[PDB]
Amino acid sequence: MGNERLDELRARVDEINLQLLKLINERGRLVQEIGKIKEAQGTHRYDPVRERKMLDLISEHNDGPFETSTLQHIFKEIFKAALELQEPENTIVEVKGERIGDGNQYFVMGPCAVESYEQVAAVAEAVKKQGIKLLRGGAYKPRTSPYDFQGLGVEGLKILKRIADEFDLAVISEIVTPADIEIALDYIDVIQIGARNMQNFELLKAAGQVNKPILLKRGLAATIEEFINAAEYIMSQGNGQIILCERGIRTYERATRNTLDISAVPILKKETHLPVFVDVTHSTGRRDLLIPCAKAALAIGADGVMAEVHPDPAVALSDSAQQMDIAQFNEFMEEVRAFQ
Amino acid sequence: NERLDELRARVDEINLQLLKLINERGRLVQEIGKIKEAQGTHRYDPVRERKMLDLISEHNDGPFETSTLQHIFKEIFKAALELQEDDHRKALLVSRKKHPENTIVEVKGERIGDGNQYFVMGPCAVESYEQVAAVAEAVKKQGIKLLRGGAYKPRTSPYDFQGLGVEGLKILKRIADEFDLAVISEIVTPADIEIALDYIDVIQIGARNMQNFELLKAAGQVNKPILLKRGLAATIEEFINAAEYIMSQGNGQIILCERGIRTYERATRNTLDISAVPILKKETHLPVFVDVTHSTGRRDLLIPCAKAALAIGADGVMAEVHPDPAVALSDSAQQMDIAQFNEFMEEVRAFQ
Amino acid sequence: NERLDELRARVDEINLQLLKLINERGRLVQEIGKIKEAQGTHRYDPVRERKMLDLISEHNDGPFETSTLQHIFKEIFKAALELQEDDHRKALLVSRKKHPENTIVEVKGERIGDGNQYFVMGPCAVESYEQVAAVAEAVKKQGIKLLRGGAYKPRTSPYDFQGLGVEGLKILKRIADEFDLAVISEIVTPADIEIALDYIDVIQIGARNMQNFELLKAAGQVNKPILLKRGLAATIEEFINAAEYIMSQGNGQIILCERGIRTYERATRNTLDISAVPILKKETHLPVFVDVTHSTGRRDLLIPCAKAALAIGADGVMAEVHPDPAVALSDSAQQMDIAQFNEFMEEVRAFQ
Amino acid sequence: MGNERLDELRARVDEINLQLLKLINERGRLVQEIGKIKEAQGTHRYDPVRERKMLDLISEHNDGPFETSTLQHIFKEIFKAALELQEPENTIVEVKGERIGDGNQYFVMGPCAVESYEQVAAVAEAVKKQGIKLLRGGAYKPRTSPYDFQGLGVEGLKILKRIADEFDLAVISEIVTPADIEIALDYIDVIQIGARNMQNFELLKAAGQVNKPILLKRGLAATIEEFINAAEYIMSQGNGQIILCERGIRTYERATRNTLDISAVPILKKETHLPVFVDVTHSTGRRDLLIPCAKAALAIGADGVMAEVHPDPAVALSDSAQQMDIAQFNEFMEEVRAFQ
Ligand SMILES: O=C(O)C(=O)C[C@]1(C(=O)O)C=C[C@@H](O)C=C1
Ligand SMILES: O=C(O)C(=O)C[C@]1(C(=O)O)C=C[C@@H](O)C=C1
Ligand SMILES: O=C(O)C(=O)C[C@]1(C(=O)O)C=C[C@@H](O)C=C1
């Protein structure tokens, strides 16, 4: 039975959106032409006098529904864009044979921080036995308290490369400054951007410019819109090898470190066609939730799950209470293995 | 520059074409809002938006990147949404647009929202006659007319003190008469509304009950000032709409109280949202108070926050006083003893 | 290394001295908790903490920086606080520690929390016999026993459809009998609890009423399963404590429903908190459901989220179905039409 | 009348805290000694085998109240600190005669972004006439959307220095990367760290190492604890010239861009003895709230208020809807001036 009149009103709106689309772009072309003319004379692209003059035209005789302040905002967005302009199936990221976003489901495992060769070695052996190809380790660790461990740094990356080769593993690590992006290309297989750096644009650029998979974590308090925009930044600069990781978001809830937002996954999968992972360790911040949340994450259709393993977590240098020991890790794997 | 002028000429011609389509779009959107408002469907539809943005994306060949156009078009949809929201707010009895002049609530001679600034003071919970008596004496000496006390207390634990209940209301009426005070208390269920009319001068609805709609209705149906506290996690829109439930039932004697909102921040019990005050004062014609004790949850902030609240133009400030807070049965760490209260008063005497 | 050993020997000796003081400290803290729990004062006192940290700061000459010691001592105070919190949780009737074995609620043959997984399905609001009839037929064909419908609807606007009320409950009872279904509905005020017993099989408390304590009590006092939805902005602690109000009154037939929580995120009506489920299942002995329709507020997420919810070990999933959602009087964009529902069922058939 | 027994229990607890304080520090000394011994042999500071051995001792016969997992966490914090260790009246910041945190109340004013000489000049003239010494401008602007303006950069700093000299003003600007810290010393009087960079530790260090006032904005979603820790980082590295700015925090509320947290001010003032400012423009995100919120902020005892002014905001390149035009600014000043 339905609503004939709502549909037709919406039809009309759509039909207007296309008319708008066409005009904005013809406007675009004209703007390009103008830039060429201006730039030839060596005249600045941005003209606030000209903008004000155009806004005055828009503002005259406004008896449409909107406030004038509002219209000007709309038209201002248009002029911004004009200025900036003067100057679909699923993405796959192969890393060492893993075709992430193949539709299959991958696991990343390894210690929070890299602390020694023998440390990481211990883990690598254990994970390889679990048929995991993707290992992750913190060569650099972003550090909120004053007695936190910053990372071994390059010595870290060396250790990972060593392990990578030795054990036939793809190895993943966070990098924290544009300088170090370049350096890491030689040691690691995927570069991670931590959540605190989701809006470190310098770094994003830097990563946008290499031939390397990027693992971009969603910010502590980032909207999805924002997260997407950060990814599009990397891509817009050449690098389309991007994996998104949900890792929880910050809420009033104290039972959990962060609040895991599984809704994000299908949404991100739908709106970008990048693969999306979930970090069960840093979202919950709780050993007891790791397994359940992994399942959840698989069910909902994440491309992979990421968690942290360390041979003696009680003495680790980061995340003592969050990491799985190797026993805990094997139990964990048996149980999501049985997610069949 | 002959050619730059002539290019701008044409751009102008387009801006008008755009202007006209944006506005026609506006109108259709209003038509939709009316439908949505009738049938009670949420104003904001992200599934719908993404469907519209996919068409834009399926039909873009022009020069601008798709991510960029989508940004532009979102700003349009935002504005379309705000148009609807402002359209519904226009017609509410709680808005200034409906009732421009600002509402006054007389209680025992206090003309709240007259432009002056009033204080509500008293213990969190009513525990005994003598307890409240103690406080009342102290406050009266500070020229305060408005006393508040918890006849009923909503509680996180059911094993925590729930209130003396009616015995509570009796004690307050007694004090009211004895001390010539207007006396305020929270009531928690529609049944008890009726009963309280005999004892107290303003009925408070606690934050946890902001969306207990039956209680609202019940309160909407009496001849009594209501003091409506904003919910733990309520948008302003919502808070306003709860005030609408009350006015819609006949009662327009409503005072809004900001009392903080819930955030990730642990240093403070809640996060006091001072922005709300001038907003509520702009968007409605009701007086607005602030509860400094429950928002901060901290003795050390009571004073500062009161000043802040006066400065920003609150119609009043509300706080909690109790003769021995160490043994109080609620808010033992938050309440002012009588000394603390007199220090507090001397210091905000100086902010009107 | 002769000297390293002998230095470590001494460090060990200190670790024990520390161990012993930390524990004695623990005990004193428990003693304080008992006092605080008696008199109903908040467990966490930042003013108190800062007073303690100032002493540490006023007396530090040893080698460690003050900012560093304070960090250590905070971790101690955290643990002292958690000790109290876990002490109070121990003794609640809602905890596993009290009632280790897990609670079962039989409703019309469904043994909820038996370990199997149940589905609740039906329209947001009850609008007509034929409306609900339509849905009931469809769900029964999907082997579902548990039907839910809104006899009363809490609403942001008082001008939005509030519910048919009793006529609603009548319609549901009719359907229940006609179709051999257990039928669920929200009730919104203590008065109406009593009345509903005759019509429906489970009483729901909406999220906005999680801290409507009178309603809780009212529900605590009947022989009826209760479906308690977690508040918009409720901590887990709180949600559990609201379930305590009910059990404390006699009724232990309680089902907890997660239905999202409120966050800065606008893409979703609320943010579904899947973490809660296994937590609630660990910390209490009650079954836990998820409402996928109200948490996401999005047709496109209904399926995924259901799977997620089953996987994580929810005792059930609850969603909304309506024969023409475009004209529904609530949730027009959220509800599944019957096709959508059958697609939905075929796909989660495959997750138990 | 009171609670004699609660007081005495608390007394006892305090008396224990001091006993703990004394032992942790004697432990500290011993640890220092050990480091010297280890480092002489050229042995790594961190010994996970040794830590596990100590944790096993702690864990044996636990019939105190705490779980073992918990005790180990406590003791782990202690060992962390021991490892890191191997290796009060109010602060005043003079800038160009302003004795910020003098107890008086200062204003910072100026445009969001620096766009041209004449632009900033326009503003500077207007503010100087309002007796303001502190001018702020965005040489670098951190940039969430893809058509946002990044800043003129150095050309920006030059322009500010020019204005500073010309108009006898102290001039403030955000800097976004450690490299640029050094450069800016020559152009500006206070360096701002934006909120998105509150936990960019690289940058903090860099700023911790200069002789320059720093204006540190609190992060989008930062606890107070975190904000403080970021400040202590700068200080711990030499620079104690720090001004904290509250600028709102991110909440579910859509009527306001962010939610202004005035509670923070007195708290920060109490807990650090740094001056604290409030940014009324970026917290509310609303022209209509600027004035009220300024008052609030003054009342509550902020050391200063910061807001944004621009000669034609409708055409500005950032914050079009938030900035005050010069009229609006004068009205604004008259009204907080009348905060007497
Ligand atoms: O007309 C011009 O001078 C342009 O560069 C184009 C345009 C426009 O969008 O029209 C855009 C940016 C300028 O600041 C002014 C206007
Ligand atoms: O078509 C609708 O559903 C509308 O209300 C219109 C509209 C728009 O089209 O702007 C506005 C807000 C909604 O969130 C979706 C789209
Ligand atoms: O003395 C108190 O108020 C306590 O409950 C003890 C204690 C502690 O001392 O750990 C713990 C929690 C409070 O937030 C403050 C301090």
Ligand SMILES: O=C(O)C(=O)C[C@]1(C(=O)O)C=C[C@@H](O)C=C1
């Ligand atoms: O005993 C040692 O070897 C130390 O360096 C001291 C210490 C301790 O804190 O005892 C701290 C860190 C080391 O990882 C082991 C223990």
Ligand SMILES: [Mn+2]
């Ligand atoms: Mn980690």
Ligand SMILES: [Mn+2]
């Ligand atoms: Mn700005």
